[PDB]
Design an enzyme around this catalytic site. Structure first.
Site, PDB file in Angstrom:
ATOM      1  N   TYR B  27       0.832  -1.194   0.000  1.00  0.00           N
ATOM      2  CA  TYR B  27       0.000   0.000   0.000  1.00  0.00           C
ATOM      3  C   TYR B  27       0.865   1.242   0.000  1.00  0.00           C
ATOM      4  CZ  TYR B  27       1.176   0.658   4.901  1.00  0.00           C
ATOM      5  OH  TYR B  27       1.849   0.800   6.100  1.00  0.00           O
ATOM      6  N   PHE B  37       1.792   9.717   3.248  1.00  0.00           N
ATOM      7  CA  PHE B  37       2.085   9.618   4.671  1.00  0.00           C
ATOM      8  C   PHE B  37       2.679   8.260   5.093  1.00  0.00           C
ATOM      9  CE2 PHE B  37      -2.422   8.483   4.295  1.00  0.00           C
ATOM     10  CZ  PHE B  37      -2.460   7.283   4.982  1.00  0.00           C
ATOM     11  N   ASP B  38       2.521   7.213   4.281  1.00  0.00           N
ATOM     12  CA  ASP B  38       3.017   5.865   4.647  1.00  0.00           C
ATOM     13  C   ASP B  38       3.026   5.015   3.376  1.00  0.00           C
ATOM     14  OD1 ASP B  38       3.868   3.597   6.137  1.00  0.00           O
ATOM     15  OD2 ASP B  38       1.881   3.216   6.993  1.00  0.00           O
ATOM     16  N   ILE B  57      -7.482  -0.064  10.249  1.00  0.00           N
ATOM     17  CA  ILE B  57      -8.694   0.766  10.134  1.00  0.00           C
ATOM     18  C   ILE B  57      -9.762   0.155   9.226  1.00  0.00           C
ATOM     19  CG2 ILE B  57      -7.695   2.978  10.788  1.00  0.00           C
ATOM     20  CD1 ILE B  57      -7.591   3.578   7.675  1.00  0.00           C
ATOM     21  N   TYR B  83      -9.273   7.527  10.727  1.00  0.00           N
ATOM     22  CA  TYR B  83      -8.809   8.026  12.042  1.00  0.00           C
ATOM     23  C   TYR B  83      -9.703   9.153  12.666  1.00  0.00           C
ATOM     24  CZ  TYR B  83      -4.765   5.016  11.322  1.00  0.00           C
ATOM     25  OH  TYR B  83      -3.958   3.890  11.144  1.00  0.00           O
ATOM     26  N   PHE B 100      -5.564   5.203  -0.424  1.00  0.00           N
ATOM     27  CA  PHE B 100      -4.560   4.127  -0.413  1.00  0.00           C
ATOM     28  C   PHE B 100      -4.512   3.484  -1.785  1.00  0.00           C
ATOM     29  CE2 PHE B 100      -6.063   4.256   3.952  1.00  0.00           C
ATOM     30  CZ  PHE B 100      -4.888   4.243   4.674  1.00  0.00           C
TER      31      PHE B 100
END
Ligand SMILES: c1cc(-c2cnn3cc(-c4ccc(OCCN5CCCCC5)cc4)cnc23)ccn1
Lengths: 313, 108
Positions: B27, B37-38, B57, B83, B100
């Site tokens: 991902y 962010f990731d 999540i 979140y 994502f």
């Protein structure tokens, strides 16, 4: 397999961001090892290995937020800064978890209470705290860098003892950051009163000057130094554990209590006479005193303390 | 449901995640403004999570559960399945919708 493997590429101090939830939900809580107004610290287990889980009280939500933010935005891995693993929110009302390296010896405060120290251990303890604080305080530029950080609640309860005889600094929920992306500092009297420098107590600190906050930490470090040195044996003699200013303020002292001792009367912890017959404690007493000048500008830097402690050792 | 899925390339159109299976994915996660962010891809390490164990999540799992083996897809997750109002400090802001880019590499 191990948490160390999972930790062994991008940004932050702990697990990759989506992985923090996964590990947090795989943790089993075993026993409460600490309880306070902050919330609770638990020993927990992830796939058969210990971790610490701090569960924040709702009164302290903002500390969870700040500590989480710091560790997730700064690369803060260092032998003498508590190792962060993950932070998570979990409806169980929502609980706030900060998950870190577990240190079974507990806090320096607790350890000093029923142990006295040889010379080697005294020095190892105080050098390690200085190393951690200098690493917090120093700004490192470039891709492997970090902003400068001042802790704002340095004390013996917020330091943990490691099995290798070093300590690490914990509880970064009040910390403040200083980088080149320099807007205003994001933050007056927030810490523990007993450890507050005169300029915090009389509120003369220039609140937008990062350097000033570093010098506040140095005052508190001097007090920690004194706490530790009392427990080092010399010539068969040692002092009992006492917190700083035990002889002039009550438990849970007020601002007024502290201001009167520290600002108005200009008092400082007393150096026991027996320390002057020992070369190490004599050098430590000098070092302490150079963290406690009323004028913050005269106090030594964390890095200078570290280098000095490196030569006494 | 706060989870919209936009296929990028198909999977086998037959093998979908089942309860208790370990999903193995790559991902890359971004905010709505495109800021990453990731990313498991940047670390060259696939991410694994067990279906039904709440280890990710809700939005991410719901989107993945609709993907077939080998599929790659864009999952858009509203904050109520990600979140929420708090976000994740230092990473995800309050009320963030997240994108994502996910590839379902395997099911074990
Ligand atoms: C503050 C402290 C900690 C923490 C990490 N390990 N750890 C261990 C203890 C501990 C304290 C006393 C113990 O008695 C035996 C055992 C463990 C307390 N706090 C922590 C984690 C996060 N924030």
């Amino acid at each position: 397999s191990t948490l160390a493997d999972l930790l062994d590429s991008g940004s932050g101090s702990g697990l990759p961001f989506l992985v923090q939830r996964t590990v947090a939900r795989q943790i089993t809580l075993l026993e409460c090892v600490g309880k306070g107004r902050y919330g609770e610290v638990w020993r927990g287990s992830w796939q058969g290995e210990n971790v610490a889980v701090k569960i924040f009280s709702s009164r302290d939500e903002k500390s969870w937020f700040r500590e989480t933010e710091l560790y997730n935005t700064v690369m803060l891995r260092h032998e003498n800064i508590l190792g962060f693993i993950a932070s998570d929110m979990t409806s169980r009302s929502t609980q706030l978890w900060l998950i870190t390296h577990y240190h079974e010896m507990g806090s320096l405060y607790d350890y000093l209470q029923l142990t006295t120290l040889d010379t080697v251990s005294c020095l190892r303890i105080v050098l390690s705290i200085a190393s951690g604080l200098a690493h917090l305080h120093i700004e490192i530029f470039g891709t492997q860098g970090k902003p400068a950080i001042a802790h704002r609640d340095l004390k013996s309860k917020n330091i943990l003892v490691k099995k290798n005889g070093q300590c690490c600094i914990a509880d970064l929920g009040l910390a403040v950051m200083h980088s080149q992306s320099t807007n205003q500092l994001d933050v007056p009297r927030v810490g523990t009163k007993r450890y507050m420098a005169p300029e915090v107590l009389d509120e003369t600190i220039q609140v937008d000057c990062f350097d000033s906050y570093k010098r506040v930490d140095i005052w508190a470090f001097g007090l920690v130094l004194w706490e530790v040195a009392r427990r080092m044996v010399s010539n068969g003699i040692v002092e009992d554990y006492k917190p700083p200013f035990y002889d002039v303020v009550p438990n849970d002292p007020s601002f007024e209590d502290m201001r009167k001792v520290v600002c108005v009367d200009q008092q400082r912890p007393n150096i026991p006479n027996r320390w002057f017959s020992d070369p190490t404690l004599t050098s430590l007493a000098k070092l302490m005193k150079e963290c406690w000048y009323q004028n913050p500008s005269a106090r030594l830097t964390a890095l200078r303390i570290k280098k000095t402690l490196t030569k006494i050792d | 449901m706060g989870v919209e899925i936009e296929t990028i390339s198909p999977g086998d159109g037959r093998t979908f995640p089942k309860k208790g299976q370990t999903c193995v994915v790559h991902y890359t996660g971004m905010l709505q403004n495109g800021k990453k962010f990731d990313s498991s891809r940047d670390r060259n390490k696939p991410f694994k999570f067990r279906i039904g164990k709440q280890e990710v999540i809700k939005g991410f799992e719901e989107g993945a559960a609709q993907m077939s083996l080998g599929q790659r897809a864009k999952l858009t997750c509203t904050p109520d399945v990600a979140y929420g109002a708090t976000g994740h400090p230092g990473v995800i802001p309050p009320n963030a919708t997240l994108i994502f880019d996910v590839e379902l590499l395997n099911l074990e």
